[PDB]
Amino acid sequence: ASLPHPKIVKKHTKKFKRHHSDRYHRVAENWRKQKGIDSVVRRRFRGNISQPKIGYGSNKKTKFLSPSGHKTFLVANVKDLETLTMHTKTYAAEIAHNISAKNRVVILARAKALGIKVTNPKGRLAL
Amino acid sequence: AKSKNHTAHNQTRKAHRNGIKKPKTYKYPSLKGVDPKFRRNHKHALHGTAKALAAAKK
Amino acid sequence: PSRFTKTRKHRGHVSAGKGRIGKHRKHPGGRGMAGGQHHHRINMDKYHPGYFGKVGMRYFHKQQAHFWKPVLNLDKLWTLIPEDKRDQYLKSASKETAPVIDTLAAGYGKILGKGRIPNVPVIVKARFVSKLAEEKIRAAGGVVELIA
């Protein structure tokens, strides 16, 4: 159902991890640039981690697209969902985390009626 | 504790970054330092010349 | 405000934009105007010639009301007449009906001749005037009558 798109290319599927997030627990994995005068990572010696830069950017045709080819749009109710009535081949709905189980039923029913794809049609389902 | 006294190292690179431009040349340069005995006459001569052209194409 | 400030951008960077060698320090050249005749001399001579020394004559207990002499140039001199009657007086360029302009009530102490009032007669009441201003007024056909 998705709109035709090219092969999706990423150029770096590996998460850029902070230097020594593997060595110290106080050092979190969220990327920080090394600003040190003698940093091997800042100086880009062979054999060190890679630094994020703009050349790794994704093609503007395939940016923000999930592997299904849809752009994700968060919804909390049927009125927010109905904005994607005429955009089913481009945008897929994601029900927000804080939505209740009984309202997820309504959102999923209306999305099935309108032909809208839902990325998480299994949250808070009992059986 | 001695130190380095003087070197002209890097000064040509620095100057030529935005450098050795000629200052510039204008038409009608300054009459500054020119002889006052000449300036005093040039004033009157220019006055008369302006008057003459005015009365000419009046 | 605080969020458009470069302090927010220097977060992460060690020196906060002040350098590693120079090391932002308390008062490395002195406090205030220290060194004007010394290590700040070139600045004080390049940008403040005349700062050092005393020139002239002292005045003890100077009141800035003996010297209240605000100046009005001739070029305006009809602004002191409202727009309602200005055109009237300008088209009826006549003696026997000439407009009176008390410049003191308007807040001026001296009249000066910058340029070119029209050829209309005008009565100008002023504490002080200038030679050229009065020349121009009476050449236009008016008169300066002095007051106090």
Place this chain on the structure above:
Amino acid sequence: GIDHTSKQHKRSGHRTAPKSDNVYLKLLVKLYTFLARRTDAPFNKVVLKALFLSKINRPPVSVSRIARALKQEGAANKTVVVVGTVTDDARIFEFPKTTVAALRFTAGARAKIVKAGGECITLDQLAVRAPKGQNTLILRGPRNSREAVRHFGMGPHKGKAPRILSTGRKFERARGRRRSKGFKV
């Protein structure tokens, strides 16, 4: 690699898209960039560039300046264009019947120009009256008349108005300003 002769990735150094967030000015820009794009007239480009300018590069233009400009030969029946504001001047006592196109008019300027029989015009009505700049006369105001320019270029033997708050005797009138006190500049 490249041995580069120039500086790479340098901005032109010229303003586009005026940083004023005024929507009416943005609309004037939308009109005049279209006209500059399609009319082949230099007037449109001049006006478009002038609409980008800052306030100090858009000084006011006096009606007396306009009167001077119309006292030129062949300029009496022309349309004066001021990309900026027009201010009044009581130092004139006659004003002609011209038409004046400008962004803003002061109340006094508008009243003078109208009382003289003229009309005060906007740059959008100028666009329909003169899309290529027919019979126009662009006036710019004085830039170096400002106070800040007095201090630009301060140094010995320039004569350039030191930066000073309180003036009078004993404020920068001493050593460095007279041979009796050391030296004169």
Place this chain on the structure above:
Amino acid sequence: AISKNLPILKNHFRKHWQERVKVHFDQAGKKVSRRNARATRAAKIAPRP
């Protein structure tokens, strides 16, 4: 401490000025008080001006 081309500033803050800083937050309330006082005085001299 003297630096690029700038005016000589005479800022008189070399005493313990922070101990003596009166910020007139009381402007509005003190106006209200003046109006109430004028009202009370007028009522007390009820015919007088």
Place this chain on the structure above:
Amino acid sequence: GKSHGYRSRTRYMFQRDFRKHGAVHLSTYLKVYKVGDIVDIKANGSIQKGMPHKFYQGKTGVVYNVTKSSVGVIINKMVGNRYLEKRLNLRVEHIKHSKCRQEFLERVKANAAKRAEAKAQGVAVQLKRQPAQPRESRIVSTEGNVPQTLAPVPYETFI
């Protein structure tokens, strides 16, 4: 101690010459200098008045003023990252016309003559100078000029 005076390092420069000491010939004083004339500066050491600083030796400038005994010359002087214009009041013994301008003006009037001559028939003067071009083809004869064969010579001492 150090020493940076006016005539420092001028020993051989303000030397006069070999077998040309003494007074100066009168052509120096009978030459005529108008404003705009280009003049080279070469200091005479026997005339201590009106001298240039050693910097202006071998410098070429333009006249801006003329007085009783002296001439006002403008020079361009490199000071750091820019050029400043310098005004010297030099006596004429330290001054001679530059021959470059004379050789340029001769070419000016010659080009004008050529243009007026060849405008009478329209033949595309092409007055610009051009660099020395590569040399064209030619033929070399051996008539009386048969090639003389040569060889490297051995090593000898010659002492």
Place this chain on the structure above:
Amino acid sequence: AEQVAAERAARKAANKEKRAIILERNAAYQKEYETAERNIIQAKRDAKAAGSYYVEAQHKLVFVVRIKGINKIPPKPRKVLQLLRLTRINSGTFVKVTKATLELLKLIEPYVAYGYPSYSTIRQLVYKRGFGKINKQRVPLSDNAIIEANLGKYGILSIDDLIHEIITVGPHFKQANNFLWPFKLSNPSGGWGVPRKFKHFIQGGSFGNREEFINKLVKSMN
């Protein structure tokens, strides 16, 4: 305003004339080149017959290639390379031979390889790596309309007339060669021939005047 047939046909007709003109001009240029070769050949022959020597005309054109990277160049060679538009390694430019340019080349000799190009390599360069400076942009030529629009002032209509103005060094060589963007050449496909580049071609290196061996190198680089 149907305009899809009449004006289209008129445009096609106007193009037919330009192509006829180009065809005849190119035939003339071929006849010129072949005669210019055959005549110097026969002149050498005739001088040998008469017992004389034929000194061929010194060349009017060289092709210069930058052989050295951009680091560690003194200022005078750096400026001369910028003036010849050789701003990267293996960039190439045609140079008119004059006393004003031979000294330039003597200055930049340890950084370039130059020599005398042939019609074949000039033609191959202009056809494979042929780029023009149009409004400060590097446009592939790919058609004669670009050349007619940007050099039609100077009698030039075709890539072939351009090659002719180059090789038969004409009045408008300056403008043609400036129109031509510097040739961006690859490294030689067979190698440089020597083990070590930065000696003179004479001493077993690569830089300097390799008078007629530059065609081989350039064809390997193009």
Place this chain on the structure above:
Amino acid sequence: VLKKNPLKNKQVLLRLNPYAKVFAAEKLGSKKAEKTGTKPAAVFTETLKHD
């Protein structure tokens, strides 16, 4: 959108040059020369063979 190289792609070759059609028709890349009966002088040969 793509630089097609002449010296291959005969179509682009002919777009640039119409003379390329008759060049091949006449095989001007393999033109034969008129034979000549010129012989050098004795001075040339003896100077060449000289020691």
Place this chain on the structure above:
RNA sequence: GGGUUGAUAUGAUGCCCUGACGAGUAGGCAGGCGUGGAGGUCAGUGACGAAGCCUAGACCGUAAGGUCGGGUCGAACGGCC
């Protein structure tokens, strides 16, 4: 550096075309991410489970970070200007 307001549809700071370029400490500038609180709005989420916490489970973004699922929990909390 240029093109493109034409009516009908969405964004003129938009879309599009063309060419070139891309190292970087100190330092400068710009565009963005995230936090506590304030005004406005989504008649936003929420005891049918808010926030927080754990999760070699998933997705988006060059990254800052954002989103989802599961577990735990119990009362509040977010998106946009």
Place this chain on the structure above:
RNA sequence: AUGAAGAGCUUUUAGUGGGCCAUUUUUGGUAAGCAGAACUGGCGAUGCGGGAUGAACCGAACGUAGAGUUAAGGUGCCGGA
């Protein structure tokens, strides 16, 4: 002659004001990986291939990738040839 990559102009402000190495010129010193100058180029601020190893030497300067060709240096094995 060649080239111009836009030319010219102004305002304001940061950091810096310990330097070091190589070729060549050169001073003191027996000499120094010593001290001090001149010109350029570099390190500092710079990773990459080579020099086993190295701040500076050779080569070459860096967005992310693919293919090809090469520089310097190499092709008994370690080691691609």
Place this chain on the structure above:
RNA sequence: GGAUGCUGGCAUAAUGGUUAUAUGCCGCCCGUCUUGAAACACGGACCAAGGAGUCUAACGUCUAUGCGAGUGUUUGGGUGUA
């Protein structure tokens, strides 16, 4: 002035992602002063939370806005849903 046509298999963990491990090659400890740090130079055993260019008076350049030869309501007064 940029690849289309024909055919087959699978239609699932098969490709792919993540993760651990193995293998080949590379890979010195961060931060800091310094010409020069992996240093036999200094700090750092670990973790959480807290933790450092702020506010003000007076100014400068620039920018934006309002009016414009004028400009500044807010010391104060009037009024008020305070």
